[PDB]
């Protein structure tokens, strides 16, 4: 076919497939939910298998997984690093301590959620959110990206 709209969709898809197949994460590793992510990186549940690299610096990172309490002192940093990533960037909040406030919600030093400091795309629930659950959450980010249609909106704009 040639009517551009079709052509555009196909192109977008390719773009989405590339970003969704290779997501390079970065793990601030606040707290413990970091241990449950290292497990994902580990052999039972290989993250790489999916195209997620075990480690990445902020410049080269597609997704930031905030694992653990985002305390008030670390809150300015989180932002900095979120602000130091590329134009196509995403945030997967991991842990009840970062989805909301968790066991430490009413504390004076804990931000009640990272979505008060960084926009969050997928919220993975559980105190130590199971590694399979993170993997489920990373896979749902992949379905979120697949649906994104950036060029078709350009074309229809």
């Amino acid at each position: 076919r040639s009517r551009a709209e079709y052509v555009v969709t196909k192109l977008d898809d390719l773009i989405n497939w590339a970003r969704r197949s290779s997501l390079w994460p970065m793990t601030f590793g606040l707290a413990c939910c970091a241990v449950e992510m290292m497990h994902m990186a580990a052999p039972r549940y290989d993250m790489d298998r999916f195209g997620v690299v075990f480690r990445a610096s902020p410049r080269q990172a597609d997704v930031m997984i905030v694992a653990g309490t985002l305390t008030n002192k670390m809150a300015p940093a989180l932002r900095k690093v979120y602000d130091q990533m590329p134009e196509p960037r995403y945030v997967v909040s991991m842990g009840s301590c970062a989805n909301g406030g968790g066991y430490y919600h009413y504390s004076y030093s804990v931000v009640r959620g990272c979505d008060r400091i960084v926009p969050v795309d997928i919220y993975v629930p559980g105190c130590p959110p199971t590694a399979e659950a993170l993997l489920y959450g990373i896979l749902q980010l992949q379905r979120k990206i697949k649906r994104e249609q950036k060029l078709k909106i350009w074309y229809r704009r």
């Binding site: 497990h39 580990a42 039972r44 305390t71 002192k73 066991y103 430490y104 004076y108």
Partner: protein, 386 residues
């Protein structure tokens, strides 16, 4: 300020929250002033507003690599204040999962140490073994980590019917897995260099800065709170403390690999000699009544209702009880009024003392040396920040 740089909190090195300001004349470190509190969360103040049983989950989060061993310290502390002691089977359990937890911590400390050094294959090799252990936790507690299994009066629920057998198959083999790591790092012509003679700590200085852990044991001081002041039934087992000489990053490492080995000796015994019995004190006053009992007996419902809604009501007093958590001496100073909710609960973290030593250890050292020393202290910022 010698081009002072701040070690990154996000940095892959570190446990995620270490802003180590370091003034460095080129590649030499002149002074390290670690900053802390990037993970302060209020754990000590929050506990004052919670009942004894609802503050147990906080202890698992204080240093969560060592999930349970930490609980045992609060357990012991609350049991002392009540002058109640757990039933015989529960004691062995706590030593069984106490040790399994030590392995879990050492697999974390040795393999994460290497990842910062640059060796990445040991981590994947042993994280698979870790994984298998987590499954023990899950099939005993319900949670992979953050179990809440060791409660103030014993364990929560007896082991599933079949766990012991599997904690055997694993133990029967884990050794080879430690052996492998060895063939990759103990004698690597290169591990030794980056680790040997780095962060040597004298014996007198280690006691002075309150190191109290492998860090002391590595310098040759013989102190294992598990042999000196036995807690639970760690007295009935027989193990050898792995003391070290020429204390340095390499020697202490060897010590941590040796306690992984000695813990398999303690686990074996616990499987060989765990008694038939109950896993929680029979005082409905301290331990919650069995669900069949609370659903058929009035005194049990009343005791279930009051225990869950109000609490233990510990007698007024204060105690400092210290165990030998994998990192080092983990102690809870729990001051308590007669109320069901504690008054103070300073958690002594093996780690607040160790970090402080970073300055006196990493002197005239290169940027890479600092990375090696943070590893040889097994710093989990949860315990330090509390």
């Amino acid at each position: 300020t010698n081009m002072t740089l701040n070690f990154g909190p996000q940095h892959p090195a570190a446990h995620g929250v270490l802003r180590l300001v370091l003034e460095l004349s080129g590649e030499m470190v002149r002074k390290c002033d670690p900053h802390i509190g990037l993970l302060h969360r209020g754990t000590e103040k929050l506990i004052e507003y919670k009942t004894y049983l609802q503050a147990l989950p906080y202890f698992d989060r204080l240093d969560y690599v060592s999930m349970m061993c930490n609980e045992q310290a609060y357990s012991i502390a609350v049991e002392k204040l009540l002058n109640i002691q757990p039933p015989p089977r529960a004691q062995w359990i706590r030593v069984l999962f106490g040790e399994i937890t030590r392995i879990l911590n050492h697999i974390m400390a040795v393999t994460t140490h290497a990842l910062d050094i640059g060796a990445m294959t040991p981590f994947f090799w042993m994280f698979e073994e870790r994984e298998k252990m987590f499954e023990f936790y899950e099939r005993v507690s319900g949670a992979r980590m953050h179990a809440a299994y060791i409660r103030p009066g014993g364990v929560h629920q007896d082991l599933p019917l079949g766990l012991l057998d599997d904690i055997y198959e694993f133990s029967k083999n884990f050794s080879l897995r430690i052996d492998e790591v060895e063939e990759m790092l103990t004698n690597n012509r290169i591990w030794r260099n980056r680790t040997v003679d780095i962060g040597v700590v004298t014996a007198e200085d280690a006691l002075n800065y309150g190191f109290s852990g492998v860090m002391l044991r590595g310098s040759g001081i013989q102190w294992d709170l598990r042999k000196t002041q036995p807690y639970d039934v760690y007295d009935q087992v027989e193990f050898d403390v792995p003391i070290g000489s020429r204390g340095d990053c390499y020697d202490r490492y060897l010590c941590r690999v040796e306690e992984m080995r000695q813990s398999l000796r303690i686990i074996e015994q616990c499987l060989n000699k765990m008694p038939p019995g109950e896993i929680k004190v029979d005082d409905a006053k301290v331990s919650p009544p069995k669900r069949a009992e609370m659903k058929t007996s009035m005194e049990s419902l009343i005791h279930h209702f009051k225990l869950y809604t109000e609490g233990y009501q510990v007698p007024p007093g204060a105690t400092y009880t210290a165990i030998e958590a994998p990192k080092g001496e983990f102690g809870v100073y729990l001051v308590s009024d007669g109320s069901s909710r504690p008054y103070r609960c300073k958690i002594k973290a093996p780690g607040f003392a160790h970090l402080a030593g970073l300055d006196k250890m990493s002197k005239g050292h290169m940027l890479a040396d600092v990375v090696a020393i943070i590893g040889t202290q097994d710093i989990v910022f949860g315990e330090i920040d509390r």
